[PDB]
Amino acid sequence: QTQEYTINHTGGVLGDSYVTTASNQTSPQRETAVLSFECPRKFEEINYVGQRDATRFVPRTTESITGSANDDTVVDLTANIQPVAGEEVIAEQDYPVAVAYNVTQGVEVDVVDADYAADTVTLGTNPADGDEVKVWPIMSDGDVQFRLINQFGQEEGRVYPWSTPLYRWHDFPQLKRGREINLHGSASWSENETLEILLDAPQALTWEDSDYPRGQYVTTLEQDVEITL
Amino acid sequence: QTQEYTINHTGGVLGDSYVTTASNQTSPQRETAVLSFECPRKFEEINYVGQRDATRFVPRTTESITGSANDDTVVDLTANIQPVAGEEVIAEQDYPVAVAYNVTQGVEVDVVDADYAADTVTLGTNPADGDEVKVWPIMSDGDVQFRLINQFGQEEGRVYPWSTPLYRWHDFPQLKRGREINLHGSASWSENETLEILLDAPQALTWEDSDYPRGQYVTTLEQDVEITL
Amino acid sequence: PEIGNNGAEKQISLHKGQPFIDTQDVGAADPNTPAVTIEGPSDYVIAIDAGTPVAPEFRDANGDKLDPSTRVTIQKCDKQGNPLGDGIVFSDTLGRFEYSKMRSDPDYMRKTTTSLMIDEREIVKIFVEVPPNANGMDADNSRITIGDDTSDYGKAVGIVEHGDLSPAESKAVRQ
Amino acid sequence: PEIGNNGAEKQISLHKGQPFIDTQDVGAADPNTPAVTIEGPSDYVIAIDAGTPVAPEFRDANGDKLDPSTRVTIQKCDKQGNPLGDGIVFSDTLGRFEYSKMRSDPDYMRKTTTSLMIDEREIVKIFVEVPPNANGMDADNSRITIGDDTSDYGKAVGIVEHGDLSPAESKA
Amino acid sequence: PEIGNNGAEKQISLHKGQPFIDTQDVGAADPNTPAVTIEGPSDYVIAIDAGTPVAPEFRDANGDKLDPSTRVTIQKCDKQGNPLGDGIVFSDTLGRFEYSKMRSDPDYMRKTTTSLMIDEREIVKIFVEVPPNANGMDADNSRITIGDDTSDYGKAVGIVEHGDLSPAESKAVRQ
Amino acid sequence: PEIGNNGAEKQISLHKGQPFIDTQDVGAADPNTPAVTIEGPSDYVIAIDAGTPVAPEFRDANGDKLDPSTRVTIQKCDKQGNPLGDGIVFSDTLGRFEYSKMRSDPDYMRKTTTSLMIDEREIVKIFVEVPPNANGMDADNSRITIGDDTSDYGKAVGIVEHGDLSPAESKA
């Protein structure tokens, strides 16, 4: 009867219809709904348990600059920054804190290091004047949470009262049992009822850019759940 | 456990590998093997019963002519001919006794009638001189039979001693219960063992021509069988 | 491989393309000859029941049906082409078959009248009576069929090897 | 006015223009794709007997019949669109119907092989195997029909509301 | 010389270079096929416990890892390539392994969810779901491994000859 | 929808971005000044067990770690910001954490010494002793974390609403 699956921000067991993504909002700090999963017709019910079900959620943002004659090799940012689980070094991390891509030169761009104290990052390359650039740094200073919807956009409850910060979420090394993250709360729902994963943070996150090298979908969520067939 | 399936001269439940087709031989009248089915790895066994399992087998041949200035509108043949279950009329038959196709004019060619006594047939159109033609008339004057092979090209027995003539096979209206054809014999085999369907007749039959309008595969076999999963 | 030990009483049918059968052309007003001759093979026994279907489908040389006033008569014979009055079956007219649907339809399916048996060396003949000033029979296109294998309708011709059964001789003497 | 309390086991038939059925076009050599999907409505139970008629009438986009060597297979499925070996019925070829008289004639009327049942949330698919270098199926002209209402010949599809009978759960 | 009569329940593992396994390349947005097929050899019985390690290490043709949003699903099948919903195990994403230390580390060692069994003629498939506009799988560099021989950590795949034990058939029917 | 009635003793953790916590910059040789202040919210009760993890991650304004001879002291206080000798916990040095793996590793995870409790209106301060001729603390980059939710290792901070349990007053 019961199984233990993973569910992702796209498709998976659902089929890309009863998922929906969305960005947050910047100027009004508000508890937006960045993702939501609706239980399809075919399942009987879905469960969700804390301290039983593992999780992963790698968000990012997007920013841009303008090429100049001066040898920049460094860019400021609008988002608080830190390393992935802490380290000054690049390529030792579980994943890159930041990625950069040049529109003109359709190539990746490495990263040397950064201050990780102010909103700063180094670039290893020397961008030319007029060249367009994009960057997908780490995100910080946010809160994440869950809530349930009974088919109508009509809340009935909340999985767990207190929000967990995405900041801390990046801080812990993920994907290690014993050190794996496990939120609290014990939810369950049935056909056409929705779980919404909600965000409260200033910086504008992303889901799709169509010019990101390390995979198509920039960010990701991967959550464990229990299903009754 | 047990089911009642149909099996065809291509693919079907088998997968196009453990089938094999072949033509007959003309100058030495010999009991060739035109088709054969090998029980695949996955099945447990196959059965076959007479007066229980229906059948269909529509064979044809191929011939060609040469365009001429004279208004032919009729061609002789090298095969005995009759109508499909008997009738002077075309388009009333369960299927056309004969088909014709012009290489130059890549179109079908209708049929008016024929004598059906000598090796004769009419054409409704007026072929031009030099134009190439193909025709796939009915076949006649043959015998069909079954035999089993134990993985080695090494016969052990014969389903039914006495051959049935394909002539009669065309004569009966097919695909009518009560009038449906049902041979005799009760065979059964297992993994990698083969049933061969054999032909004894002069005229050169066909399986594939790549320029036949009414479907890709000209001839066909469709037999009922019983399978143990 | 596995094959079932089918019973000795095998269910069969007769037609032109066989060794123990023969035919030859016929003219007009011409009763005496068998248009078609049948003979018992060696060490076999054929049995034809009373409800056995029958199906002559004679033709003309030009590819036509003949005068339906024509008559067909199946008839058993003693050895030596010697006919016999008793045991005759299927004294029918050549018309009223509708060859198109004849075997096809159980309605049109004309059966025999009485039972019949063929010992190992015996003869069955098919005499034909055509009225004069008519066209003759053509053996290339003519045909006989009897028995109905391969159909829930109709009956089939029984055959058995004489050497298998012990009372085969008893049934042969019984006729 | 007066209406008779007809029995719960109502005699019905299936076709394209219904809500709990769907179809989609097919190309060539595409067995896994179901040309037609059926699903059990909510709180209903469908029953298909073994002697149930069957009647696919697929077409080509230009308005032609396809290669009769083509194969059709009705097949029951577990939930999540998952097929099954047992319970399958009607593994037949696309030829040898004579669509003109097919439903008309009890002779041409091809029946199923074994019984079948559809619990409230279950699936039945209709896979099609077309040989390559052939024309594809066109959903605008294709159609399925099963069961035989409105004729003393043939059988009909049984249906019942689950919420009426008490042992309907036991039968499911 | 002397060798110990090791128990019939032998502790083993699976990989590419074996006869009863096979693979083939995969493109994109392409669930239905098994990138890797496994089959039960003759007169043997394989057993995979619930705490069995798992380790796909697929690659790209150019020698890279694929989009971690890619999904992998091990799944038991009935005969005839016929999948089944129950008995499925290891519905995982292609990311979050850290192939460098994956088998090496018991932490990274991703185990199955539920038990499993393979009767003598059965199939286990490994379906893969790649998002579109991505690179395809290359069979030359891809690999599967399951079970953990040669380590105090992890479990191992059990195997037994069907002909040795009498209740082997009982366990086979038990599944 | 359905949610389980989770127990009142909820498992939580403390950090900068909360209302009932505050911080302020620090210079050098300033023990009396609390770098961080915590207060009990209204009608709630917090509980910190003895094996509770601890994790200060102070920084310099330029983005550097400070002199590891620096000292950190968590300390309970009576109301009116008044310290106490008893009840104090975690008198540790600023060095010997290895902030990289500190929370990550159960080894680097430094726990408290004795139990602790916070009645609804009480204070806990975090005094810091920096040696002179050193750089000062910068609140923008500094941070505290205590308790370990979301990990089978470590312990978590217990919390309860005072208005639910009847003997909460007796426990206070």
PDB file of N, CA and C in Angstrom, chain A residues 82 86 167 171, chain F residues 55-60 94 97 99-100 102-103 138 141-145:
ATOM      1  N   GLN A  82      26.670  34.301   1.686  1.00  0.00           N
ATOM      2  CA  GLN A  82      27.590  33.498   2.473  1.00  0.00           C
ATOM      3  C   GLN A  82      27.961  32.291   1.635  1.00  0.00           C
ATOM      4  N   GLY A  86      29.508  27.267   4.454  1.00  0.00           N
ATOM      5  CA  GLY A  86      30.709  27.876   4.974  1.00  0.00           C
ATOM      6  C   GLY A  86      31.932  27.280   4.318  1.00  0.00           C
ATOM      7  N   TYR A 167      18.179  30.987   5.154  1.00  0.00           N
ATOM      8  CA  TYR A 167      19.553  31.236   5.518  1.00  0.00           C
ATOM      9  C   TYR A 167      20.179  30.015   6.192  1.00  0.00           C
ATOM     10  N   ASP A 171      22.851  26.956   5.355  1.00  0.00           N
ATOM     11  CA  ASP A 171      23.993  26.780   6.246  1.00  0.00           C
ATOM     12  C   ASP A 171      24.266  25.317   6.543  1.00  0.00           C
TER      13      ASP A 171
ATOM     14  N   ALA F  55      26.127  28.189  19.645  1.00  0.00           N
ATOM     15  CA  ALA F  55      26.793  28.526  18.404  1.00  0.00           C
ATOM     16  C   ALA F  55      26.831  30.024  18.153  1.00  0.00           C
ATOM     17  N   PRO F  56      27.768  30.740  18.763  1.00  0.00           N
ATOM     18  CA  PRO F  56      28.037  32.116  18.352  1.00  0.00           C
ATOM     19  C   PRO F  56      28.990  32.156  17.176  1.00  0.00           C
ATOM     20  N   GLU F  57      28.731  33.102  16.285  1.00  0.00           N
ATOM     21  CA  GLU F  57      29.481  33.245  15.054  1.00  0.00           C
ATOM     22  C   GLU F  57      29.780  34.723  14.833  1.00  0.00           C
ATOM     23  N   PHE F  58      30.329  35.358  15.864  1.00  0.00           N
ATOM     24  CA  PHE F  58      30.656  36.770  15.796  1.00  0.00           C
ATOM     25  C   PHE F  58      31.679  37.042  14.705  1.00  0.00           C
ATOM     26  N   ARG F  59      31.770  38.312  14.322  1.00  0.00           N
ATOM     27  CA  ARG F  59      32.649  38.739  13.251  1.00  0.00           C
ATOM     28  C   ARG F  59      33.196  40.121  13.551  1.00  0.00           C
ATOM     29  N   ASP F  60      34.178  40.502  12.752  1.00  0.00           N
ATOM     30  CA  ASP F  60      34.712  41.847  12.711  1.00  0.00           C
ATOM     31  C   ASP F  60      34.024  42.631  11.601  1.00  0.00           C
ATOM     32  N   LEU F  94      36.129  32.346  22.565  1.00  0.00           N
ATOM     33  CA  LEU F  94      35.668  32.583  21.207  1.00  0.00           C
ATOM     34  C   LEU F  94      36.398  31.720  20.200  1.00  0.00           C
ATOM     35  N   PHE F  97      36.161  26.766  17.924  1.00  0.00           N
ATOM     36  CA  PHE F  97      34.898  26.322  17.350  1.00  0.00           C
ATOM     37  C   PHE F  97      35.049  25.700  15.978  1.00  0.00           C
ATOM     38  N   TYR F  99      34.140  27.392  12.985  1.00  0.00           N
ATOM     39  CA  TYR F  99      32.832  27.819  12.497  1.00  0.00           C
ATOM     40  C   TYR F  99      32.409  27.168  11.191  1.00  0.00           C
ATOM     41  N   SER F 100      33.355  26.695  10.385  1.00  0.00           N
ATOM     42  CA  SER F 100      33.019  26.017   9.143  1.00  0.00           C
ATOM     43  C   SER F 100      32.095  24.830   9.393  1.00  0.00           C
ATOM     44  N   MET F 102      30.969  23.843  12.538  1.00  0.00           N
ATOM     45  CA  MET F 102      30.560  23.933  13.932  1.00  0.00           C
ATOM     46  C   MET F 102      29.187  23.327  14.179  1.00  0.00           C
ATOM     47  N   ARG F 103      28.162  23.899  13.560  1.00  0.00           N
ATOM     48  CA  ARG F 103      26.829  23.320  13.652  1.00  0.00           C
ATOM     49  C   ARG F 103      26.743  22.022  12.875  1.00  0.00           C
ATOM     50  N   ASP F 138      30.848  43.586  15.049  1.00  0.00           N
ATOM     51  CA  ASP F 138      29.947  44.215  14.091  1.00  0.00           C
ATOM     52  C   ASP F 138      28.649  43.424  14.058  1.00  0.00           C
ATOM     53  N   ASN F 141      27.110  41.375  10.851  1.00  0.00           N
ATOM     54  CA  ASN F 141      27.646  40.077  10.483  1.00  0.00           C
ATOM     55  C   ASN F 141      27.632  39.067  11.614  1.00  0.00           C
ATOM     56  N   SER F 142      27.599  39.519  12.860  1.00  0.00           N
ATOM     57  CA  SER F 142      27.535  38.607  13.984  1.00  0.00           C
ATOM     58  C   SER F 142      26.222  37.840  13.970  1.00  0.00           C
ATOM     59  N   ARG F 143      26.176  36.772  14.760  1.00  0.00           N
ATOM     60  CA  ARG F 143      24.949  36.009  14.915  1.00  0.00           C
ATOM     61  C   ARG F 143      25.107  35.011  16.051  1.00  0.00           C
ATOM     62  N   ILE F 144      23.968  34.646  16.620  1.00  0.00           N
ATOM     63  CA  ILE F 144      23.842  33.581  17.596  1.00  0.00           C
ATOM     64  C   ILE F 144      22.884  32.548  17.039  1.00  0.00           C
ATOM     65  N   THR F 145      23.141  31.296  17.386  1.00  0.00           N
ATOM     66  CA  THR F 145      22.162  30.236  17.244  1.00  0.00           C
ATOM     67  C   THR F 145      22.319  29.300  18.426  1.00  0.00           C
TER      68      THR F 145
END
